[PDB]
Amino acid sequence: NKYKRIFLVVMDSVGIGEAPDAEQFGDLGSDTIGHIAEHMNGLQMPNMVKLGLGNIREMKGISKVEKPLGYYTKMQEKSTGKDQMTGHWEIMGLYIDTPFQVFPEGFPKELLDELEEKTGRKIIGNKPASGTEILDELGQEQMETGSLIVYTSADSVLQIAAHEEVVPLDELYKICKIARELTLDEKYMVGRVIARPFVGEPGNFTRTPNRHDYALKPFGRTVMNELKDSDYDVIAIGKISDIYDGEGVTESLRTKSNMDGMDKLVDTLNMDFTGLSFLNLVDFDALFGHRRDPQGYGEALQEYDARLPEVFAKLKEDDLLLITADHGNDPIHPGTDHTREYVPLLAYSPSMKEGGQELPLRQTFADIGATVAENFGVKMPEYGTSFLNEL
């Protein structure tokens, strides 16, 4: 095998400019890194610059270098949707025709009617909200009536909140499983159904750790599945395991923040493994993109960049580092949804003694999965073209 270990880092939502099909999505003008760079009066990301970020595209504070450490290009999304599961499933070798939906005005009456019909319970709420806001507003009514608080967020989720002393946990989980079946429908396709049990009294409600998530499996066996089946390590860091519903995962490391995610990446550098370490840095999307906070996003990018030199120092001759993103989420863009954007691709190994070069543009995110598959000699994905031989 060419590389013993591959470290794949998804900077979640870190897009590099509108894709050719952005107009279909209402995403003309979208530019996640570029708009952040402008807001920051120049982004400080010297380590990404050294890798060749500016060679992909020059932006404020992000300039090209004569001799990038590794290889660079961008990738274009081939699948229909710009959601979390589409982008990640494509990266690992799939093609997803049917996109996951978001619900800024709440769920269609038809879906909620059927959920009521199957459960024998009333549904209240039906809007995007934080768990705190919705409990303050409807927690007391929920307790008194035994109704279900159904709500969403900026991502593809259907959340069901019920008080633990009013709706037994087991009943709440049964209800969520019913909701999970009903939402396997392209009209209502949510990425995740989430049980949100809570306790307390009006003016003092708290969500309990008895939260359960109900995800869909990827629409195909992924490169991760093939790695696991061939006895390779597949270490998932952060949201990765959840995003693939555990498919192909041999070890999962939970993270609490981007800095904690980098700490776990460092932990995996310290592990003797053969296979894939796969990190998702989610704060970019979860705290800043959807909340349209370019300052916070910019600060987070600078915090991430400052962590990289330690990563560079630990990489071995037979390690490969891949840095990419799944979609965009431009923090200076209308609405609260993701943006359809190209994503950067940086590919670096200390064995690249003369530095890297420009790669042909990746026509699908599955090019990453294809590269990983070829490296480890496992079954090649149906989609994607390996760039292993170019490195």
Ligand X SMILES: O=P([O-])(O)O[C@H]1O[C@H](COP(=O)(O)O)[C@@H](O)[C@H](O)[C@H]1O
Binding site for Mn ion (CB under 5 A): 12, 26-27, 84, 155, 285, 326
Q: Identify what 157 binds: Mn ion, ligand X, none; CB under 5 to 8 Å per kind.
A: ligand X
Q: Which is nearer to ligand X, 73 or 159 (CB)?
A: 159
153 binds, among Mn ion, ligand X, none (CB under 5 to 8 A by kind): ligand X
User: Which of residues 55 and 280 has its CB atom nearest to ligand X in the complex?
Assistant: 280
Closest contact distance (angstroms) between CB of 104 and ligand X is 13
Scanning 110-118, 152-160, 175-183, 257-265 for contacts with ligand X by CB under 6 A, the matching segment is: 152-160
- Check the annotation: does 283 bind a ligand: no
Quick one: which of 54, 131, 261, 356 contacts ligand X (CB under 6 A)? 131
Token pair belonging to 221? 């066996």
Q: Which of 155, 247, 285, 326 binds ligand X (CB under 6 A)?
A: 155
Of the listed pieces 153-161, 170-178, 215-223, 293-301, which binds ligand X according to CB under 6 A? Answer: 153-161
C-beta nearest to ligand X: residue: 131
Which pairs from 299-302 meet CB under 8 Å and 24+ separation?
Answer: 300/258, 301/14, 301/33, 301/36, 301/43, 301/45, 302/40, 302/43, 302/44, 302/45
Among 157, 243, 262, 281, binds ligand X (CB under 6 A): 157
Residue 263, annotated as binding a ligand: no
Q: How far is the CB of 234 from ligand X (least distance, A)?
A: 21
Instruction: Work out whether 63 is an interface residue with ligand X (CB under 6 A).
Output: no
Tokens describing residue 3: 């590389």
Q: How many CA atoms lie within 13 A of 86 on its CB side?
A: 24
Task: Provide long-range contacts, Cβ within 8 A and 24+ apart, for 263-272.
Answer: 264/237, 264/238, 265/7, 265/9, 265/237, 265/311, 266/310, 266/311, 266/314, 268/7, 268/235, 268/237, 269/7, 269/311, 269/314, 269/315, 269/319, 270/314, 271/235
Contacted entry of ligand X, Mn ion, none for residue 12, CB cut-off 5 to 8 Å set by kind: Mn ion
- Cite the beta strand spans of the chain per DSSP E: 5-11, 71-75, 123-128, 148-152, 157-163, 192-201, 204-207, 212-215, 233-237, 251-253, 275-281, 319-324, 343-348
Nearest distance in Å: CB 206, ligand X: 11
Residues 6+ apart with CB under 8 A from 204: none
Cβ neighbors of 272 (< 8 A, separation 6 or more) are none
The annotation status of 12 as a binding-site residue, yes or no, is: yes
By CB under 6 A, what part of segment 111-130 binds ligand X? 130
Ligand-binding annotation for 338, yes or no, is yes
Residue 39 labeled ligand binder: no
170 in a labelled binding site: no
283 binds ligand X (CB under 6 A): no
Q: Given the DSSP bridges, would you call strands 71-75 and 343-348 parallel, antiparallel or unpaired?
A: antiparallel
- Residues lying near ligand X in the complex (CB under 6 A): 130-131, 153, 155, 157
Query: Which residues carry a binding-site annotation?
Result: 12, 285, 290, 326-327, 338
Query: Which residues carry a binding-site annotation for Mn(2+)?
Result: 12, 285, 290, 326-327, 338
